Scaffold this motif. Structure first.
Motif, PDB file in Angstrom:
ATOM      1  N   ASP A  89       0.828  -1.215   0.000  1.00  0.00           N
ATOM      2  CA  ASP A  89       0.000   0.000   0.000  1.00  0.00           C
ATOM      3  C   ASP A  89       0.861   1.263   0.000  1.00  0.00           C
ATOM      4  O   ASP A  89       0.806   2.096   0.904  1.00  0.00           O
ATOM      5  CB  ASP A  89      -1.011   0.017   1.154  1.00  0.00           C
ATOM      6  N   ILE A  90       1.658   1.387  -1.055  1.00  0.00           N
ATOM      7  CA  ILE A  90       2.406   2.599  -1.375  1.00  0.00           C
ATOM      8  C   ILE A  90       1.895   3.001  -2.756  1.00  0.00           C
ATOM      9  O   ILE A  90       1.025   2.298  -3.285  1.00  0.00           O
ATOM     10  CB  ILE A  90       3.925   2.351  -1.307  1.00  0.00           C
ATOM     11  N   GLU A 130       0.495   8.337   2.813  1.00  0.00           N
ATOM     12  CA  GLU A 130       1.416   7.460   2.105  1.00  0.00           C
ATOM     13  C   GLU A 130       2.844   7.963   2.236  1.00  0.00           C
ATOM     14  O   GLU A 130       3.789   7.231   1.968  1.00  0.00           O
ATOM     15  CB  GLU A 130       1.032   7.349   0.628  1.00  0.00           C
ATOM     16  N   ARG A 131       2.993   9.223   2.654  1.00  0.00           N
ATOM     17  CA  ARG A 131       4.319   9.789   2.871  1.00  0.00           C
ATOM     18  C   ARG A 131       4.982   9.232   4.124  1.00  0.00           C
ATOM     19  O   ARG A 131       6.210   9.264   4.228  1.00  0.00           O
ATOM     20  CB  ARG A 131       4.228  11.312   2.956  1.00  0.00           C
ATOM     21  N   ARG A 185       4.413   6.019   4.848  1.00  0.00           N
ATOM     22  CA  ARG A 185       4.618   4.626   4.475  1.00  0.00           C
ATOM     23  C   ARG A 185       5.636   4.452   3.364  1.00  0.00           C
ATOM     24  O   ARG A 185       6.269   3.398   3.286  1.00  0.00           O
ATOM     25  CB  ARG A 185       3.300   3.986   4.036  1.00  0.00           C
ATOM     26  N   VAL A 186       5.798   5.446   2.491  1.00  0.00           N
ATOM     27  CA  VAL A 186       6.880   5.396   1.515  1.00  0.00           C
ATOM     28  C   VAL A 186       8.220   5.564   2.213  1.00  0.00           C
ATOM     29  O   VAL A 186       9.161   4.799   1.979  1.00  0.00           O
ATOM     30  CB  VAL A 186       6.661   6.460   0.425  1.00  0.00           C
TER      31      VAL A 186
END
Lengths: 653, 653
Positions: free
Chosen positions: A87-88, A135-136, A138-139
């Motif tokens: 989930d990226i 997502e920042r 998680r990335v």
């Protein structure tokens, strides 16, 4: 026939008649620079200087063009389909199939390996980020689990300890990856049914997902499910055509390209985005990202799971590459696999990708199309280069479940391993327990902690094999040197007083309580009870007592034969035993918990005037008992003999 | 001498000349009521019906009066001194040395055991309460760790699995209890120096205490330290007098009573409480407490540490009781020790006590004074009864560091185990690594989790022993049947073409990659490289190729001898080998990861027309290879022989 006429040897009368060689038994020969030593260190840490200057250009170039393109289109569509398991954004799956493909060209020692992501490490990375966010965010936290698991892999191919893959049997490998092919099949239901599931985590993570998916099963999509069943049906049966027709079919059918172009063609023109409500891959930005520095707050709380990703990325890389190493007959170095994949997961982790190693469903595409060297892994990274920079404006109408159905067509090889209860139960039943206890621990405790508690249980089934050994008692068959088990044949003559024993197992801490119990069972009497009854009868001759004086009843007798009538009403028990052979042929090792228990039962048995011999030991087993100080003035060194008929011929004369 | 004249037997020509017995190889014989079966079940679950009706009253009563009083005064003063290690009120250490002493009178199978608390389980209970809180919340949570660790012990003596104590060697027992005698020596500094230290917990718990004690070292007491150095000096050197004078000294000196009466006499009359500021034991209330029900909120978060208390309370109870079981010669049941201590820690946990088992420094007081039966453990619980009810108004001027110094005089026996690097390094060096890795894991990860990670490392040193075995190559010494290692003696004649090998280890998943590598090293050639070079030379006769057709190069040859000149420019390598013995005498077991690798190297070696024999296996090793389906039309069953000189006499004829 079989005639022998040698004299009787007692392993100390053998090493005097036959002289040994007395040959001599580190920091000078290795730590020494030489003009012929640093040549094969530099050409072994950098092995592109050993296949590139010898390249058959007329014979290997045209097979490496057509097999680099055929694994280039697979690496793109598998790369996007494994960035969704973390989930990226999906463009971060093309920075993980390009940067490990360039580094492994130089430092890589295998020649039939396509390096990228693969679905067992898109979940171990995917479950570590959820254990590093709470997502920042998680990335930048999936590209710091990569750098942590690339420093651990680099610091294991520098310490030269790349033999860790021998601690994983085939029952633990076919039990883990079958349970890892259910976690993949379950976590690909967020994208087929188009459901919004929160990111679960800790133990029992598959039933937390199945509870969250099937509680929204009335809210699925019909335009996102009939296009993940048309794709799943065709790309399975066309892959059935290829492996059924490996002959009479040159350059087999690339179904992973011609099905996407149909699926990305129908989604642009029939307008699946605004008519229905289906999720698509976005518009990827053309170009790479600036490098990032990994933060220490991600390193501290997930140091326990990058010891799981670093030992899964190698156990797949050494299981897949050893298939093509025994097929094409070239030596494979197991420590260069740890350096070239420790540097791959540092460069691709700094440049915002995620972790990965070789895939069995992609390396077989490179190997079967005709890939000879790793030049087919370079041209398989020029096409991932042109998709990122130039033609990334395509693959935006891709429907995000054509990608989630192409990664379910690869689970035929990893789900047909369920027919190992049908094989290992009828054969072993200990390595059928390692298959079951790995499938249960992985599917309950998670992928990362299901390998720590499965290797540790796999080492309990070497103790279970040698916990209750089948201790025997031997006898002679036919007045010759054949000594086999007494409860098996008919004319077995065991001599008068001799009692041959046999332990078919190494004796250690889990084994000496059972060997001592079984020896005094198969000899008739206990030897310590009959030493105390003799000393009580000897004190009555020279004539009970309280505590701290019972310690004189276990003393050796110092003065009678204790076999005829004693001249008073004395009932000390009698024995017919006057020897005890011990077959230590199958004994592999002893330790300090087994020597101290074996020395105890040789000292009881000698003080009853019963001559104990030990028979069958090689040269190294006697030369180690000199270091335990097993020998003294009571247990001599003339109790060791060579063979069983050697000791019995010494007793009868 | 040694003459043999038997014919040559090939283990299938032996089981036809000598017929076997064919003897037959559970739920009916055990699950069957009988008038002679339930007699010895009831008299074995309740063994007070087997020593009480046979009691020598004239000989054993006066030795059980004076040895029940002498362990009664020890059980009181050790009971108060172990309630402070848990930090509960001190009267709760007399409910833990009385209630397990009554229950073990009935259900107990040992006869020289004084049951109570002991300082390794006043800390494992003491660290579990601090991991279950985050004095009324510590009394009610130390009496629920007891009930949880008494249900686990009861549900292990009902399932009849009380052989778990064999998984703990003496190096793991002398490494754990030496590290547990430093945790006791450190956590008794809160009471000698009189410092208020917060309750610590998780990993590295001893350095958290040493940081909290020595940061207040200017705030100690001088009236609380000179009375813990006078007591610590006298009760050590008087205990030196007793064990030096075990003879010529009947009923040795009770220093643990005559020093307290001096110390409780000087504290009442010189008024140490109000002149100085020293902590004393309070005024205990006379009487017991009402029973309590254990709460589930204590059971849920400390279920992982009552699997540590339940396997420490048994491993001390079976190590201490087996000392007096081999000294007084009576059978000891290891499963009745789990029922009688599972019911002791339920009754004493319901009635507000804490967990415990036998102590080595208290059972040696009962055994050396003259205790014959467990009647001396009943009269040792009438004096703990009269101290609770009647004379509890005394021991209130006791100075709380006379108690904390009497429990440091017992740490001479558990700290003199440091001289095992001076013994195990010169002897084993694998069981000196289990001593070091247990002393480090216990003192860092804590007492409870330092036994889970030390048993799991102890099972890695059975794999380290049999990971790189000393594979040999044998030869004949003196034209007889003596076959020993070739690099050891002088006139060793190895025949023409025969190559005897020997693996002195069981072959499994950690061993078959090394045995296959060492076999093709000690034979001269690889057998798969020379099968492919022959098939390439055979296809050139009937006349390279791409992938998916290399699989025909490993096929068996079907047509020449491949040893003379071939009629074209062909350079297939030649071999002088025409046999290969394998000495499987020392091989204990095979598994499915080792059979599939051994079958692979017997199939390569046969297709080169090299006759492979396997030599030295007993009856059970061949009868298990019928269940792995090791045999087919290629690897027959006539490759197994009896002895090495049996196979070599078959080759030369």
């Amino acid at each position: 026939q079989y005639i022998v006429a040698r004299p009787v040897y007692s392993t100390n009368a053998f090493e005097e008649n036959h002289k040994k060689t007395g040959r001599h038994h580190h920091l000078k020969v290795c730590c020494s620079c030489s003009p012929q030593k640093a040549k094969r260190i530099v050409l072994s840490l950098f092995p592109i200087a050993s296949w590139l200057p010898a390249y058959r250009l007329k014979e290997w170039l045209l097979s490496d063009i057509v097999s680099g393109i055929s694994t280039g289109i697979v690496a793109v569509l598998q790369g996007l389909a494994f960035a969704l398991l973390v989930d990226i954004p999906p463009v971060y799956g093309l920075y993980a199939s390009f940067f490990p493909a360039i580094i492994y060209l130089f430092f890589g020692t295998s020649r039939h390996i396509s390096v990228g992501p693969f679905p067992i490490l898109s979940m171990m990375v995917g479950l570590a980020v959820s254990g590093a966010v709470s997502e920042r965010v998680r990335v930048a936290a999936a590209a710091s689990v990569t750098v942590l698991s690339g420093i651990i892999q680099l610091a294991f191919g520098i310490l030269r300890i790349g033999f860790v893959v021998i601690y994983l049997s085939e029952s633990l490998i076919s039990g883990f990856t079958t349970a890892a092919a259910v976690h993949v099949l379950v976590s690909q239901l967020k994208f087929i049914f188009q459901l919004t599931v929160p990111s679960h985590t800790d133990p029992v993570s598959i039933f937390k997902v199945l509870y969250s998916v099937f509680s929204q099963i009335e809210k699925t999509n019909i335009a996102d499910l009939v296009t993940a069943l048309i794709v799943l049906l065709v790309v399975s049966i066309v892959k059935e055509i290829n492996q059924r027709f490996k002959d009479k079919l040159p350059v087999p059918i690339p179904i992973e390209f011609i099905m996407t172009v149909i699926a990305a063609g129908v989604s642009y023109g029939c307008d699946f985005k605004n008519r229905f409500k289906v999720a698509v891959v976005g518009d990827m930005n053309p170009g790479f990202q600036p490098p990032i520095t990994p933060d220490v707050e991600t390193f501290q709380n997930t140091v326990g799971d990058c010891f799981g990703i670093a030992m899964v990325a190698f156990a797949v890389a050494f299981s897949v590459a050893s298939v093509y190493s025994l097929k094409y007959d070239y030596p494979l170095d197991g420590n260069q696999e740890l350096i070239a994949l420790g540097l791959g997961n540092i460069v691709c982790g700094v440049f915002r990708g995620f972790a990965g190693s070789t895939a069995l469903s992609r390396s077989a595409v490179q190997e079967s199309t005709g890939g000879k060297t790793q030049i087919a892994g370079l041209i398989g990274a020029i096409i991932v280069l042109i998709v990122v920079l130039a033609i990334g404006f395509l693959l935006a109408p891709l429907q995000k479940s054509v990608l989630a159905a192409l990664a379910l067509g690869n689970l035929k090889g990893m789900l047909m391993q369920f027919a190992e209860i049908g094989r290992l139960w009828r054969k072993d039943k200990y390595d059928c327990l390692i298959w079951i206890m790995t499938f249960i621990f992985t599917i309950v405790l998670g992928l990362g902690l299901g390998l720590a508690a499965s290797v540790a249980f796999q080492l309990l089934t070497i103790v279970f094999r040698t916990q209750f050994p089948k201790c025997s008692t031997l006898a002679n068959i036919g007045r010759t040197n054949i000594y086999k088990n007494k409860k098996d044949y008919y004319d077995m003559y065991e001599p008068e007083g001799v009692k041959i024993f046999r332990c078919p197992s190494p004796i250690y801490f889990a084994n000496i309580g059972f060997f001592r119990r079984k020896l005094i069972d198969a000899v008739g009497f206990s030897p310590l009870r009959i030493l105390r009854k003799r000393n009580k009868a000897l004190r009555k001759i020279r004539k009970e007592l309280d505590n701290n004086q019972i310690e004189v009843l276990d003393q050796p007798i110092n003065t009678i034969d204790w076999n005829d009538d004693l001249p008073l009403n004395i009932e000390v028990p009698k024995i017919s035993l006057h020897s005890l052979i011990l077959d230590f042929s199958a004994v592999s090792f002893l330790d300090v918990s087994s020597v101290r228990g074996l020395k105890s039962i040789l000292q009881e048995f000698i003080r009853i005037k019963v001559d104990v011999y030990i028979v069958g030991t090689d040269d190294d087993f006697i030369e180690k008992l000199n270091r335990y100080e097993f020998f003294d003035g009571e247990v001599k060194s003339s109790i060791f003999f060579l063979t069983i008929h050697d000791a019995v011929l010494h007793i009868l004369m």
